[PDB]
Scaffold this active site. Structure first.
Site, short mmCIF file in Angstrom:
data_model
loop_
_atom_site.label_atom_id
_atom_site.label_comp_id
_atom_site.label_asym_id
_atom_site.label_seq_id
_atom_site.Cartn_x
_atom_site.Cartn_y
_atom_site.Cartn_z
N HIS A 1 -6.48 12.59 -33.74
CA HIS A 1 -6.51 11.66 -33.16
C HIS A 1 -4.37 11.36 -33.18
N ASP B 1 19.27 9.79 -7.45
CA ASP B 1 18.27 11.49 -7.84
C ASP B 1 18.87 11.37 -9.38
N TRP C 1 -1.50 13.35 -41.02
CA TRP C 1 -0.47 13.18 -39.37
C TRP C 1 0.81 14.14 -40.57
N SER D 1 11.16 17.59 -26.20
CA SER D 1 11.34 17.06 -24.87
C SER D 1 11.56 15.47 -25.02
N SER D 2 11.47 14.75 -26.01
CA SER D 2 11.68 13.23 -26.45
C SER D 2 14.20 13.46 -26.44
N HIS E 1 10.44 5.74 -39.36
CA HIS E 1 10.38 4.11 -39.25
C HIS E 1 11.17 3.54 -38.10
N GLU F 1 10.13 5.07 -35.32
CA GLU F 1 9.96 6.14 -34.25
C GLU F 1 8.50 4.63 -33.34
N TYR G 1 9.29 1.41 -33.38
CA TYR G 1 10.47 0.73 -32.59
C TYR G 1 10.88 1.61 -31.66
N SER H 1 8.88 -9.11 -21.15
CA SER H 1 9.41 -9.81 -20.15
C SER H 1 9.58 -10.30 -18.85
N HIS I 1 11.22 2.14 -47.23
CA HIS I 1 10.60 0.66 -47.88
C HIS I 1 9.02 1.34 -48.24
N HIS I 2 8.96 2.64 -47.85
CA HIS I 2 7.61 2.05 -46.92
C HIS I 2 6.95 2.94 -48.48
N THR J 1 12.87 -10.31 -34.53
CA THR J 1 11.92 -10.05 -33.73
C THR J 1 11.13 -12.01 -32.97
N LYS K 1 12.66 -13.29 -30.68
CA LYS K 1 12.20 -12.74 -28.99
C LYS K 1 10.95 -13.42 -29.02
N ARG L 1 -8.43 5.42 -48.06
CA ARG L 1 -8.35 6.01 -47.02
C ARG L 1 -8.55 7.42 -46.42
C1 HEA Z 1 -2.44 4.59 -29.92
C2 HEA Z 1 -2.75 4.73 -31.09
C3 HEA Z 1 -4.07 4.41 -31.63
C4 HEA Z 1 -4.95 4.29 -30.72
C5 HEA Z 1 -4.88 3.96 -29.44
C6 HEA Z 1 -5.84 4.44 -31.71
C7 HEA Z 1 -8.13 3.94 -31.70
C8 HEA Z 1 -8.60 4.10 -32.55
N1 HEA Z 1 -8.63 4.37 -34.68
FE1 HEA Z 1 -6.81 5.06 -35.29
N2 HEA Z 1 -4.99 5.50 -35.84
C9 HEA Z 1 -3.59 6.12 -35.54
C10 HEA Z 1 -3.02 5.03 -33.71
C11 HEA Z 1 -4.53 4.85 -32.94
N3 HEA Z 1 -6.01 4.63 -33.43
C12 HEA Z 1 -2.40 6.04 -35.83
C13 HEA Z 1 -1.33 5.84 -36.07
C14 HEA Z 1 -3.70 6.75 -37.26
C15 HEA Z 1 -2.82 6.95 -38.60
C16 HEA Z 1 -3.68 8.08 -39.83
C17 HEA Z 1 -3.33 7.81 -40.90
O1 HEA Z 1 -3.18 7.03 -41.60
O2 HEA Z 1 -3.54 8.60 -41.51
C18 HEA Z 1 -4.42 5.87 -36.97
C19 HEA Z 1 -5.94 6.09 -37.95
C20 HEA Z 1 -7.36 5.57 -37.71
C21 HEA Z 1 -8.08 5.72 -38.63
C22 HEA Z 1 -7.74 5.98 -40.26
C23 HEA Z 1 -9.19 7.75 -40.93
C24 HEA Z 1 -8.90 7.38 -41.83
O3 HEA Z 1 -8.82 7.15 -42.70
O4 HEA Z 1 -9.47 8.60 -41.93
C25 HEA Z 1 -9.51 4.95 -37.99
C26 HEA Z 1 -10.93 4.72 -38.91
O5 HEA Z 1 -11.65 5.06 -38.35
C27 HEA Z 1 -9.53 5.09 -36.60
C28 HEA Z 1 -9.96 4.09 -35.85
C29 HEA Z 1 -10.01 4.18 -34.50
C30 HEA Z 1 -10.21 3.33 -33.51
C31 HEA Z 1 -11.78 3.02 -33.69
C32 HEA Z 1 -9.80 3.43 -32.02
C33 HEA Z 1 -10.42 3.25 -30.92
O6 HEA Z 1 -9.98 1.87 -31.10
C34 HEA Z 1 -10.46 3.71 -30.20
C35 HEA Z 1 -10.38 3.17 -28.66
C36 HEA Z 1 -9.35 2.88 -27.94
C37 HEA Z 1 -8.44 2.07 -28.20
C38 HEA Z 1 -8.99 0.26 -27.94
C39 HEA Z 1 -7.15 2.35 -26.70
C40 HEA Z 1 -7.33 2.57 -26.21
C41 HEA Z 1 -6.55 3.88 -25.89
C42 HEA Z 1 -6.72 4.40 -24.46
C43 HEA Z 1 -6.03 5.92 -24.82
C44 HEA Z 1 -7.06 3.70 -23.42
C45 HEA Z 1 -6.71 4.86 -21.81
C46 HEA Z 1 -5.83 4.26 -20.93
C47 HEA Z 1 -4.75 4.38 -21.24
C48 HEA Z 1 -4.56 4.36 -22.41
C49 HEA Z 1 -4.50 3.89 -19.32
N4 HEA Z 1 -7.74 5.53 -36.95
C1 HEA Z 2 3.37 -0.32 -33.38
C2 HEA Z 2 3.75 0.08 -34.13
C3 HEA Z 2 4.43 -1.18 -35.34
C4 HEA Z 2 4.83 -2.37 -35.22
C5 HEA Z 2 5.21 -2.54 -34.19
C6 HEA Z 2 4.82 -1.99 -36.30
C7 HEA Z 2 5.57 -3.48 -37.07
C8 HEA Z 2 6.17 -3.90 -38.95
N1 HEA Z 2 5.37 -3.30 -39.38
FE1 HEA Z 2 4.54 -1.42 -39.30
N2 HEA Z 2 3.91 0.13 -39.67
C9 HEA Z 2 3.23 0.86 -39.01
C10 HEA Z 2 3.75 0.78 -37.17
C11 HEA Z 2 3.73 -0.20 -36.34
N3 HEA Z 2 4.49 -1.77 -37.73
C12 HEA Z 2 2.28 2.67 -39.21
C13 HEA Z 2 1.61 3.20 -38.52
C14 HEA Z 2 1.99 1.90 -40.27
C15 HEA Z 2 1.75 3.69 -40.98
C16 HEA Z 2 0.59 3.58 -41.36
C17 HEA Z 2 0.20 4.63 -41.91
O1 HEA Z 2 1.01 5.27 -42.46
O2 HEA Z 2 -0.83 5.14 -42.13
C18 HEA Z 2 3.40 0.89 -40.87
C19 HEA Z 2 3.61 0.62 -41.84
C20 HEA Z 2 4.07 -0.78 -42.68
C21 HEA Z 2 3.90 -0.66 -44.09
C22 HEA Z 2 3.87 -0.25 -45.34
C23 HEA Z 2 2.18 -0.21 -44.99
C24 HEA Z 2 1.79 1.21 -45.63
O3 HEA Z 2 1.89 1.17 -46.42
O4 HEA Z 2 1.28 1.67 -44.07
C25 HEA Z 2 5.54 -2.47 -44.05
C26 HEA Z 2 5.41 -2.75 -44.59
O5 HEA Z 2 7.33 -2.53 -44.95
C27 HEA Z 2 5.19 -2.53 -42.26
C28 HEA Z 2 6.10 -3.78 -41.60
C29 HEA Z 2 5.99 -4.08 -39.93
C30 HEA Z 2 6.94 -5.27 -39.95
C31 HEA Z 2 7.92 -5.82 -40.92
C32 HEA Z 2 6.75 -4.99 -38.80
C33 HEA Z 2 6.92 -5.90 -37.67
O6 HEA Z 2 9.04 -5.59 -36.55
C34 HEA Z 2 6.46 -7.06 -36.65
C35 HEA Z 2 6.75 -7.46 -35.11
C36 HEA Z 2 6.44 -8.52 -35.64
C37 HEA Z 2 7.49 -9.87 -35.80
C38 HEA Z 2 7.13 -9.88 -37.39
C39 HEA Z 2 6.88 -11.37 -35.26
C40 HEA Z 2 7.93 -12.42 -35.42
C41 HEA Z 2 7.60 -13.52 -36.63
C42 HEA Z 2 7.87 -14.46 -36.77
C43 HEA Z 2 7.58 -15.25 -35.38
C44 HEA Z 2 8.96 -14.92 -37.46
C45 HEA Z 2 8.09 -15.53 -38.45
C46 HEA Z 2 8.43 -15.39 -40.43
C47 HEA Z 2 10.23 -15.31 -40.53
C48 HEA Z 2 10.26 -17.06 -40.68
C49 HEA Z 2 11.35 -14.38 -40.12
N4 HEA Z 2 4.72 -2.25 -41.22
CU CU Z 3 8.25 0.62 -41.72
#
Ligand code: HEA
Ligand code: HEA
Ligand code: CU
Ligand code: PEF
Lengths: 59, 47, 102, 121, 534, 45, 113, 269
Positions: free
Chosen positions: E62, E92, E127, E157-158, E241, E243, E245, E256, E290-291, E316, E319, E438
């Protein structure tokens, strides 16, 4: 040299694929992939056919 | 490459033909999508 | 933000002067309403003069509706009343008393 | 069939008909008539005063009214041009879709445009 | 079909293949995640009689499919190679062979993962591939090797896609466009390409090192010889990290674009927009470690990392304020892309601020590797990947293919998927904040009800997705009947409330992107004369 | 000449219904988990 | 002389840009030649003698005390240096290969198996 | 006539490429390699010749594409200034990714400067861990590599200036030095420093040195391809798309080798 210009002129006259350089090489390499890779990927799923089915059901 | 009008040529489908009235193709797409989770569950355990 | 009304006002009248058809009338009026600058009675009179030049009464109805509802401006009415009556009875483009009771 | 000088840009027929003779040993050939590809069309042109893919903007200052709409050179049926006010950047970016028979206008800028292709049989 | 499609060399003709693979992969992955949630509804082996390895393998599949094989192939490539060459105006992109080899290297990864799950070995270490759990010491068989080649081919590919993006946007950009007038989505994909280029090689090197350790009977990160997995975790997070972004920024670009084209008003400081995006891209590298605050680093290191995180958060917010400025003081037509954008501005912002709150150095003692972090990222992924892709599709489909969609069906689909996603992801914060771990198929007997509501929400979401694919079918089969009748909207920008409808005939669609001004999709090598801006 | 507003009157008569509606929306969006808590046998009822 | 109905893509006239581009090309060529010449001269002047001196003293130091690794293959397991937990830990089980539980048959790194 | 074809093929530096089977065949080669390796190292069948042939055919396809990428630059031509700039920038970003690979290799062990950790190492220099150190052992080759690069960089500059008998001499010198380098690399095939049993400190150095032994092979392959082309005399001193690539590669590899020699040799000793 003495063959670049004539070769380009002939290629422009005959707008054909395969680029004219290695026709024998292409004919040699074309069947080899099908003979080798297909016959080596078929066992990958053919052999575990009897292995498949491990239900491991417990209650 | 310039011999395509640009209406349905952008998709590998074909309205013409009684072989598939856009139902067998969608059924097959559903089937291939549901295949991987179902077969993954089935090979080691029950559905 | 400390922008003079007179320069853009004069631009509006001068563009209304050479209004060949309704396209420039429409674009200039839309640009004028785009700013927070509530239109002056003079610019509205010039716009109605241009509309009479191009002979499209719907433009006049639309601009009157726009004046009635463009900005809240703390719900000022008598300013709207005078700014509508002066330009209605200056020459006569009778349009408001018909769409409302319909 | 043989070497072609192609000293002038008005005597070349066939983009691949020119390869550009070089030298095996001695000195480096001059960068005039020894280039494979259409690159000579631009290098010799800029050597003699001909540019490729001009980036010059159109007449931004002129509003292009009914009397004198601006003129764009494009032999194609359609065109992608627009206006950004009399200066370089004045309003939001905007552009039109001129056609061979009718015209198009710039809406907020009021800059009326026209499509002018070269005569074709 | 083989003569032009399977042997394709056209960016437009391959973007649709990108889309088709994306939608198929998404449907399959949503089905398997449906399963994953379904065995999580109640404690015990409700549907998975033993064999927790299967549960782990499904989780890995998944995560990997959504991350690397679903949306990164979708918005990066599929939208990039269909808009960027099209918005530039070049006939092209340079070397479409690059795009073709990038695309065709996907499916064997899918088959190798499906057979790796098929074999009794399985890849059930998450994963993330942290050692030694993925080596011969714990997991034998070919599953690890197949997954490693899958990630390698996806990275290749990326890299090819990023190469094509960079070369097209920098080498032969159209004459009218310059540095100070370049639109926003292309800036987003450019910064994305830069981060991808600076992120891929370290992952490739580290994972090749793991493969060599598994094969060459050596160990660089495993203790078997004196190595330490802390170095590998450093490298993997250094890749990871950037990825998120990479996958999120093009969503910023498209959002936008849609709010600019639907508010009838220009952007609010596009220079500020690109400043924010570039600052985010450059600042993403300051938090490589940081993670893993749980490791036990020095206090100064934790302080510097949390300072970097709180610095990262600011652009952010800038924005978000910019989007609010764009929407403020403007007419709004409440169409479905606006619905997706508003759902983004709400839920992505709330999730991001929660993550910023967690971004404290000592706050990982409560949330790290718990359900709180999954509630964290599920939010932002769903908003910026699922909803961003939905907005793009409903914003470009009527023109890129000429086929409209049922507006009522789109609205009900959005409502269904939104409520489903909310009701699924919201409880998991309550799950995590208690401190439940988890990656366990079976859980203690405390939060059964939250899992149950999550499961019913998952069923709601999959019903929404089925409705979405039905909408796709109806659009593909009933487009000409839908255009003529009143079943769909045929002009996204209604006329200004001064302008007559007869004059509106020559003012059909005028915006800040050329692809909207094109006719029905012409031949692939369109644009005989490049567009020039005065 | 300061016709009508007096910002306070119109401002209140517009905001107060809007603020009440927004607060009610938040109340429902946080009471549905509370609704689940009540309906579910949290206390063997 | 291929035909042209109205204009043979004349574009901008033969303005002063031609000689400017010529000057740019010859300036680039002259810069390349001059930098190559001066780099060669400074290399043969000082850089090459210093490189040779570094090479010869590196060879001398390698042949003086860095050649002691020749007899490191035969060493009793009773006078090991005061090392630490870096080694002497469990290793990967051997399944493929024949030579001393490793790919390269070099039993020289350690005397502990 | 001239204007219309100029506009229709000017901003279009892409040929109307035939249904090229390169993508599917190369993808098939990679997938076969992956699955065959997985089945061989730990699986059901341990045959080695067939997977060797798979690797061979993958390398043949790669060589075929790599020779085409320069043959179509001269035999087909159809290139402008913009596409040359793009190809050069692509080679630059490729070598930048290679530099990033090298930096990751360096950082795999270069972050332990002042011993911030406690156990499992954290001691610079690693006292007690004294096997046959791969440090200072190949420096006798590194110095001659520096000298060869210095003496051939300006030779290749004179190449791109004239492409004459001096260029032939420079190419021959490069062939000799790369032959010497591959010979001295293969002489330390099995017993170079040691094997990996315990105490992994120089083993990572050995692996890092080993995994980079393919870039020089790629350089030699490109040099040989250009040698064959200029023996055919298709490529004059004109669209030298390969000469620029080789000069930039030799101008970046000397820099990266200098950066490698800055540390890891006299640092900690
Ligand atoms: C795109 C990113 C994405 C999406 C859509 C989902 C969708 C869902 N995810 Fe998952 N998930 C992850 C990204 C995503 N996840 C990642 C990165 C982890 C990390 C694994 C880890 O932590 O070790 C994770 C792990 C994760 C866990 C951790 C399990 C465990 O602890 O072992 C669970 C537990 O229930 C969960 C639940 C779900 C459920 C119920 C949905 C449901 O919402 C499914 C329904 C889907 C959505 C509502 C989105 C629609 C998706 C589409 C594809 C629509 C298709 C159409 C178009 C794309 C055009 N996800
Ligand atoms: C779509 C992908 C996505 C995005 C957009 C983000 C967005 C952010 N993430 Fe996250 N993150 C993940 C995907 C993502 N993350 C995944 C996959 C993990 C790992 C889980 C796993 O390992 O299973 C993770 C985990 C993760 C961790 C570690 C937790 C962990 O164990 O998982 C932390 C902590 O440092 C963090 C921070 C942030 C922050 C600060 C942003 C910010 O960029 C959020 C951007 C939004 C804003 C911040 C809004 C603007 C705020 C304001 C309006 C200003 C207000 C405050 C001020 C005064 C500045 N992320
Ligand atoms: Cu991070
Ligand atoms: C559909 C709309 C979207 C989903 C909202 C509901 C999801 C939460 C949920 O379904 O909650 C489920 C909880 C039950 O909890 P339980 O443990 O007793 O379930 C175990 C036993 N089934 O309440 C409810 O059954 C509420 C049922 C409706 C009550 C209102 C009408 C009463 C007459």
């Amino acid at each position: 040299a003495n063959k670049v210009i004539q070769l380009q002129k002939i290629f422009q006259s005959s707008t054909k694929p395969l680029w004219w350089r290695h026709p024998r090489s292409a004919l040699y390499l074309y069947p080899f992939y099908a003979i080798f890779a297909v016959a080596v990927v078929t066992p990958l799923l053919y052999i575990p056919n009897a292995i498949r089915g491990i239900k491991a059901k417990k209650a | 490459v310039h011999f395509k009008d640009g209406v349905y040529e952008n998709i590998p489908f074909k309205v013409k033909g009684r072989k598939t009235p856009y139902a067998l193709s969608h059924f097959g797409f559903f089937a291939i999508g549901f295949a991987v989770p179902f077969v993954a569950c089935y090979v080691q355990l029950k559905k | 933000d400390e922008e003079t009304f007179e320069e853009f006002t004069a631009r509006y009248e001068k563009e209304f002067d050479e209004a060949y058809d309704l396209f420039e009338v429409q674009r200039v009026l839309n640009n004028c309403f785009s700013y927070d600058l509530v239109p002056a009675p003079a610019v509205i009179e010039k716009a109605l003069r241009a509309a009479r030049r191009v002979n499209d009464l719907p433009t006049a109805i639309r601009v009157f509706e726009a004046l009635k509802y463009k900005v809240e401006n703390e719900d000022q009415y008598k300013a709207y009343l005078d700014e509508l009556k002066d330009v209605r009875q200056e020459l006569g483009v009778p349009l408001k008393e018909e769409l409302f009771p319909s | 069939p043989v070497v072609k000088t192609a000293q002038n840009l008005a005597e070349v027929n066939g983009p691949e008909t020119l390869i550009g003779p070089g030298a095996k040993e001695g000195t480096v050939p001059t960068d005039l008539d020894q280039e494979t590809g259409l690159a000579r069309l631009e290098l010799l042109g800029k050597l003699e005063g001909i540019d490729v893919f001009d980036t010059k903007p159109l007449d931004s200052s002129r509003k292009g009214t009914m009397k004198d709409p601006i003129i764009i050179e494009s032999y194609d049926d359609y065109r992608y041009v627009g206006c950004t006010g009399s200066p370089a950047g004045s309003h939001t970016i905007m552009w039109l879709k001129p056609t061979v028979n009718e015209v198009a206008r710039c809406w907020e800028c009021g800059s009326v445009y026209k499509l002018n292709p070269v005569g074709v049989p | 079909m083989v003569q032009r499609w399977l042997y394709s060399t056209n960016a437009k003709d391959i973007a649709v293949l990108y889309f088709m693979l994306a939608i198929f992969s998404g449907m399959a992955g949503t089905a398997m995640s449906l399963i994953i949630r379904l065995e999580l509804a109640a404690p015990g082996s409700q549907y998975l009689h033993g064999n927790s390895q299967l549960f782990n393998v499904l989780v890995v599949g998944h995560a990997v499919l959504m991350i690397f094989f679903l949306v990164m192939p979708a918005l990066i490539g599929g939208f990039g190679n269909y808009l960027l060459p099209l918005m530039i105006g070049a006939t092209d992109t340079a070397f479409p062979r690059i795009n073709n080899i990038a695309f065709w290297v996907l499916p064997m990864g899918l088959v190798c993962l499906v057979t790796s799950t098929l074999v009794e070995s399985g890849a059930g270490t998450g994963w993330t591939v942290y050692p030694p759990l993925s080596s011969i010491q714990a997991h034998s068989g070919p599953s690890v090797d197949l997954a490693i080649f899958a990630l390698h081919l996806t990275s290749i590919s990326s890299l090819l896609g990023a190469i094509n993006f960079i070369v097209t946007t920098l080498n032969m950009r159209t004459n009218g466009m310059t540095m100070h007038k370049l639109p926003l989505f292309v800036w987003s994909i450019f910064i994305t390409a830069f981060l991808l280029l600076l992120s891929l090689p370290v992952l490739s090197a580290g994972i090749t090192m793991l493969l060599l350790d598994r094969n060459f009977n050596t160990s660089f990160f495993e203790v078997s010889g004196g190595g330490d997995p802390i170095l590998y975790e450093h490298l993997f997070w250094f890749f990871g990290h950037p990825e998120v972004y990479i996958l999120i920024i093009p969503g910023f670009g498209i959002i936008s674009h849609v709010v600019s084209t639907y508010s009838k008003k220009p952007v609010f400081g596009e220079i500020s927009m690109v400043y924010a995006m570039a600052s985010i891209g450059l600042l993403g590298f300051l938090v490589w470690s940081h993670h893993m605050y749980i490791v036990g680093l020095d206090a100064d290191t934790r302080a510097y990392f949390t300072s970097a995180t709180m610095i990262i958060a600011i652009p952010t917010g800038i924005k978000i304020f910019s989007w609010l400025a764009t929407i403020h003081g403007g007419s709004i037509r409440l169409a479905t892309p606006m619905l997706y954008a508003i759902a983004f501005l709400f839920l992505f912002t709330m999730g991001g601020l929660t993550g910023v709150a967690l971004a404290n150095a000592s706050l990982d003692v409560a949330f790290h590797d718990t359900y709180y972090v999954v509630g964290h990222f599920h939010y932002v992924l769903s908003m910026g990947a699922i909803f961003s892709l939905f907005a793009g599709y409903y914003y470009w489909s009527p023109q890129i293919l000429g086929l409209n969609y049922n507006e009522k069906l789109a609205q009900i689909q959005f409502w269904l998927i939104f409520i489903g996603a909310n009701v699924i992801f919201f409880p998991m914060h309550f799950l995590g904040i208690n401190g439940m771990p988890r990656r366990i198929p079976d859980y203690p007997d405390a939060f059964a009800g939250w899992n149950y509501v999550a499961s019913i929400g998952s069923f709601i979401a999959t019903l929404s997705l089925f409705l979405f694919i039905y909408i796709l079918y109806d659009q593909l089969v009933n487009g000409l009947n839908n255009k003529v009748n009143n079943k769909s909207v045929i002009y996204n920008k209604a006329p200004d409330f001064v302008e007559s409808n007869t004059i509106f005939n020559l003012n059909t669609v005028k915006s800040s992107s050329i692809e909207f001004l094109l006719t029905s999709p012409p031949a692939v090598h369109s644009f005989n004369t490049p567009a020039v801006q005065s | 000449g300061r016709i009508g507003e007096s910002w306070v009157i119109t401002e209140g008569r517009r905001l107060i219904p809007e603020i009440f509606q927004w607060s009610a929306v938040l109340s429902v969006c946080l009471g549905w988990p509370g609704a689940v808590y009540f309906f579910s046998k949290a206390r063997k009822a | 002389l291929p035909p042209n109905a109205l204009k043979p893509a004349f574009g901008p006239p033969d303005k002063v840009a031609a000689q400017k581009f010529k000057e740019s090309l010859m300036a680039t060529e002259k810069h390349a030649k001059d930098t190559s010449n001066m780099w060669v001269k400074i290399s043969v002047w000082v850089a090459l003698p210093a490189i040779a001196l570094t090479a010869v003293n590196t060879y001398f130091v390698e042949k003086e005390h860095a050649e002691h690794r020749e007899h490191l293959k035969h060493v009793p397991d009773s006078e090991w240096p005061r090392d630490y937990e870096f080694m002497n830990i469990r290793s990967k089980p051997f399944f493929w290969g024949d030579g001393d539980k490793t790919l390269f048959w070099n039993p020289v790194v350690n005397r502990h198996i | 006539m001239t204007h219309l074809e100029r506009s229709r093929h000017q901003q279009h530096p892409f040929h109307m490429v035939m249904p090229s089977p390169w993508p599917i065949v190369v993808s098939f080669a990679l997938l076969s390699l992956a699955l065959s390796t997985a089945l061989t190292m730990h699986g059901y069948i341990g045959n080695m010749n067939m997977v060797y042939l798979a690797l061979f055919v993958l390398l043949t396809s790669s060589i075929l594409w790599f020779r085409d990428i320069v043959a179509e630059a001269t035999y087909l031509g159809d290139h402008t200034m913009a596409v040359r700039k793009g190809i050069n920038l692509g080679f630059l970003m490729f070598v930048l990714s290679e530099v990033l690979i090298f930096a990751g290799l360096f950082w795999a062990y270069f972050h332990s400067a002042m011993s911030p950790d406690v156990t499992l190492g954290a001691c610079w220099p690693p006292v007690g861990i004294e096997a046959v150190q791969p440090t200072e052992l190949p420096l006798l080759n590194t110095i001659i590599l520096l000298s060869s690069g210095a003496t051939v960089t300006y030779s290749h500059h004179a190449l791109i200036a004239g492409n004459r008998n001096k260029a032939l001499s420079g190419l021959l010198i490069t062939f000799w030095l790369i032959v010497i380098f591959v010979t001295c690399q293969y002489i330390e095939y099995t017993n170079a420093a040691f094997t990996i049993s315990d105490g992994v400190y120089g083993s990572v150095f050995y692996a890092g040195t080993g995994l980079h032994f393919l870039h020089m092979v790629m350089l030699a392959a490109m040099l040989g391809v250009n040698y064959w082309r200029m023996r055919n005399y298709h490529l004059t001193a004109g669209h030298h798309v390969g000469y620029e690539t080789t000069i930039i590669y030799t101008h970046v590899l000397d820099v990266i080798w200098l950066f490698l020699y800055v540390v890891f040799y006299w640092w900690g000793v």
